[PDB]
Subunit: 189 residues, 4 copies
Amino acid sequence: SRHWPLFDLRITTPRLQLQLPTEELCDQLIDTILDLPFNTLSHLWQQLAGFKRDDWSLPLAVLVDGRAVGVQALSSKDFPITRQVDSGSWLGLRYQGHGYGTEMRAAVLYFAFAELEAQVATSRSFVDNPASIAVSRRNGYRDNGLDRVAREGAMAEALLFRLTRDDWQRHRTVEVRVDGFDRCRPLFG
Amino acid sequence: SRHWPLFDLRITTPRLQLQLPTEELCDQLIDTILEEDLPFNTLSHLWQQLAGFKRDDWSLPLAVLVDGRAVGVQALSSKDFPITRQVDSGSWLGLRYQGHGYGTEMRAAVLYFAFAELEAQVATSRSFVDNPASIAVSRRNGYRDNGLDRVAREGAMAEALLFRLTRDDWQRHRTVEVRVDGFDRCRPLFG
Amino acid sequence: SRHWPLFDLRITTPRLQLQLPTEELCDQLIDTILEEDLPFNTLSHLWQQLAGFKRDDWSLPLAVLVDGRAVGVQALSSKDFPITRQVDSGSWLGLRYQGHGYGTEMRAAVLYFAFAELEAQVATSRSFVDNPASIAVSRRNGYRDNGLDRVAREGAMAEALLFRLTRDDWQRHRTVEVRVDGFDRCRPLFG
Amino acid sequence: SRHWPLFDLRITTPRLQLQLPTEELCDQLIDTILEEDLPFNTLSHLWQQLAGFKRDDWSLPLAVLVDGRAVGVQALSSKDFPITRQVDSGSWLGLRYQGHGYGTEMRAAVLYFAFAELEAQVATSRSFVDNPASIAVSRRNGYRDNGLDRVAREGAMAEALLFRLTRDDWQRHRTVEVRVDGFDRCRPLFGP
Ligand SMILES: [Sm+3]
């Protein structure tokens, strides 16, 4: 939308551009994924609509050559107080195995640490998703506990991760640029 | 969106087209309203209605187009529709588009959709007692009185008129020519 | 509870006493209803209503006592009361206590509390069309017809008649002596 | 209530009795806390937890009694318990009642309930880094480190240590004798 400055945020790496999904990018994302189409829109709509200073979720479309290939989300409750963010992500099947996962994580963590002035970033992976765990290792996260949840009716264990600003800085390798954030700054605090 | 059949629904009258608001229509609708927090408030509300559709609890905000331009919104909603067969409506129309009878026509459009396509038995609406435009729309569309209510509006008491229109009353007295296109693929979502 | 002044409220009529249900009274109300999920569902609903009390959104589920036995519930509730000055009521009465004039006495009890203690200007109620006893109680107490609503009830459509009672209509029709105790300490909670 | 079997559950240790708070016990717990909005805030919170019980999402706030006096609450919670077999706990103890070893004993009580009766596989807890007592309870009860969090607490950032205890570790190292009465009837309430 042209009535919401978060739509003008761009985060760019040498290979990727991240931005809030417009109608066109959402439909590209659904093609990438392909009840699922509506569930995907519904979820993105609800995240966009629920943005508040003290409870926000930014689902960023990840673009390779201008094409949406997945989503890298950043979120936080009580950010102005905790200075802690959490992330989640998915990447289309045919785009996995090319290091986009690591690069797109790098991109949101730069945004978090350099623009939002976060002090900690968290993530989690199912223990049977080594690719996502490898992304966390590469970005310098430290193990931060075990959790058990219901995943499609069966027990799944999740590994939790913690990345401080200092550890982030020591481990970073990806060049990241942020544009459009000046008008957005008042939304976060 | 190209991945949700409700976006292909079209309701057309002699002067109007109603359809689910796309990204472009939402932004046009916000342009109309602005004729600070209001833009996000508006997107947020539309987004939550689009995302919240459930067979047993839905709201359908339809952008109202006059010669291409989004001039306002005519909504229809219902909780437990398959059981109640009762729908409710609410609406707004940009100030510079008021006084042309678009209000009456847009209400007639969703009533046709509710009765002819959804097979509703009853449609309801409400107006603040000091909204003469909405009250006129209801009278021109042949609704019955259905009660007097009171609510809080901006920290003060506001009285509200309730309206009810039944399917047979509508069948026998309706006068607006309405066409619905793209409903067959939507049909399963409602029943 | 000894920590919430609403528990000290007493409304008394010639044959009835109404009060917020304590633990023992909730359990008697459940005894009454049972003339497997039902006990917990009742408990859960009463707890949630007790817990949800807010000045701008409250529900008062009053146990109705005949000779010490909890026989039914006469509820009063209101959203934005300080602004609207309007209250709503609902009730149920155990099967074997029906047909003895308790329904009208229990409505008179809460109506007096609303108009004389809370200083309400309007009281509303609704009754399903297939509940003529409850309809008659509304007519007996002076309520006027105020619309029709359809809702889902046990997976089937049930039509409700809505009722409206102004303070003047209340006054004109009131016959039952009502006394209210323990309200002074509750006063701040309501406004 | 005499219409909800969870009220007939009793968990006892050498010094303590734990049970779901009746109306009288809620009022004693509030008396203990008071040693303005606080009474109703407490009632409303207990009422909501009592009412919110579902197989797939429950919270069990247990009043802790020392010779009939209500000194605190030891809670046990789980979302999707029948699947995860993981429980979480939280608790408070009246200022007057701290430093007597009740915190460790009350934790031991719910752990035994969780592992011996609910057949939990994992128990978790968290403590603010500036709550040395709660941290010591987790350590005395054999929990291991399970990470670091930050939360907003009264408008300021507060760090919390997370703790995790497995059934095996509990079985090997538990020390407190615990008795649980009134659980048989409650079995179907916790299973699918
Ligand atoms: Sm009729």
